[PDB]
């Protein structure tokens, strides 16, 4: 198997505009949304067909109840942060927890929090400690680290539970998550050479330009990997042509264990 990951996000907003939910939580497997919940619907719902297909209503009922409680806890934590920051107005609180199962079978796990979109607290599951970015985070770190059982609960969830869930969802979504659609790649010129790839899945891809067999990363403009809307992705990379000297340029594309070279004549 390629590398895969499972992660859950939470977003809390302290003084939301009339439309906006004060709390949202979304799960992902790789780039695929799998679950959603917010404080307007107050229901946890699947965001992928193969999640709804394989988890019975009892599962969504139970997790809906869990998310209603996590929502209240999240509000209580944000209220505390903003009071301690002595901040007025609307501020955001975010959480991300998850794990990766790597190609070699090794695993990673992570848990971290943000305030106003900036790192706030970062869990280290190997030293069982919280990294604090400022002295408001530092107060929380001290309270959280005084509850040693909860740190241990988090380490076990990251290292064992999360990986078991990920393997279960990977099987549920096998036909989507474990497929390969190779890139279609072409070179055009707009004077720069553009190497353009589209139609590919998974989104991980590496494109670069070589100039007479050497790679000059400083000379290359790298486009983002973008969703095309049909479940595949597109990407591009460009280099500028030397108008005084010709050179042998070649686009190089690596995708899902296949390498491709487009020599520009």
């Amino acid at each position, epitope marked *: 198997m390629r590398t895969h990951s499972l992660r859950y996000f939470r977003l809390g907003v302290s003084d939301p505009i009339h439309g906006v939910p004060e709390f949202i939580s979304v799960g992902y497997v790789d780039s695929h949304p799998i679950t959603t919940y917010d404080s307007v619907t107050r229901q946890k719902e699947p965001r992928a067909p193969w999640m709804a297909e394989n988890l019975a209503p009892d*599962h969504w009922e*139970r997790y809906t*109840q*869990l998310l209603r*409680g996590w929502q*209240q806890m999240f509000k209580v934590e944000l209220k505390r942060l903003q009071r301690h920051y002595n901040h007025s107005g609307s501020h955001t609180y975010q959480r991300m927890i998850g794990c990766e199962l790597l190609e070699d079978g090794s695993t990673t796990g992570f848990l971290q929090y943000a305030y106003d979109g900036q790192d706030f607290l970062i869990f280290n599951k190997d030293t069982l400690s919280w990294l604090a970015v400022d002295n408001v985070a530092h107060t929380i770190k001290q309270a959280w680290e005084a509850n040693q059982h909860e740190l241990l609960y*988090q*380490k*076990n969830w990251l290292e064992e*539970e999360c990986i078991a869930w990920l393997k279960r969802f990977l099987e549920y979504g096998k036909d989507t998550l474990q497929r390969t659609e190779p890139p279609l790649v072409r070179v055009n010129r707009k004077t720069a050479l553009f190497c353009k790839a589209h139609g590919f899945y998974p989104p991980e891809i590496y494109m670069t330009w070589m100039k007479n067999g050497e790679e000059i990363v400083q000379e290359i403009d790298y486009g983002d990997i973008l969703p095309s809307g049909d479940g595949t992705y597109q990407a591009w990379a460009s280099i500028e042509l030397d108008p005084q000297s010709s050179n042998l340029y070649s686009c190089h594309v690596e995708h899902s264990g296949v390498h491709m070279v487009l020599q520009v004549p």
Partner: antibody
Amino acid sequence: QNIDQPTEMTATEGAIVQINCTYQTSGFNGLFWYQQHAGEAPTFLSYNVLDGLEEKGRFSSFLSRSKGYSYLLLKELQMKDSASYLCAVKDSNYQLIWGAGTKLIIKP
Amino acid sequence: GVTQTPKFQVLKTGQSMTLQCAQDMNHNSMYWYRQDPGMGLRLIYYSASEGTTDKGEVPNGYNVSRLNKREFSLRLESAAPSQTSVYFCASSVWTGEGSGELFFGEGSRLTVLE
């Protein structure tokens, strides 16, 4: 899902007893021991979720996740240790699954 | 801690009864269990927060109401012999804390008779 512990155990004052709890659950978010004197509220004793032994006075609690079992170890038994001991496991849905309890009888 | 009442109650089949439970620990979550010989505690209903309830493993024959943050009552609308049991109220800081332990009341012994 199933939690198993012996119905009853009898040991002598001043000795040591090990109360076993095995579990087969769908996922694992930790194992709890509670003590419950006859006629009284259960009270929390211990929580284990990573492997190994944790001590708390005369009581130790051990966990092995790969074997799916825990024990509560009581050293230097006193008559006041007479009580039932309840094991409980939180599963993948954060549901507490309770064992039927082990009644510990102490011979003076 | 957790205070529940009554300590004992005899009831006739078909009678209605309300068990009371309060906690003064500023906990959010409260629970009602029954304890029966030869089996583990079974959850009847709980209340993750002030102003919400939810079913447990054996809710048939029972109802609950979370009156304020402190109080969480269990009612038997139509008492049945099978409801002869010892009922325990419990609370915890948050239902959704992984490692969070329960704090139990003293228990309410109900005997339902024909």
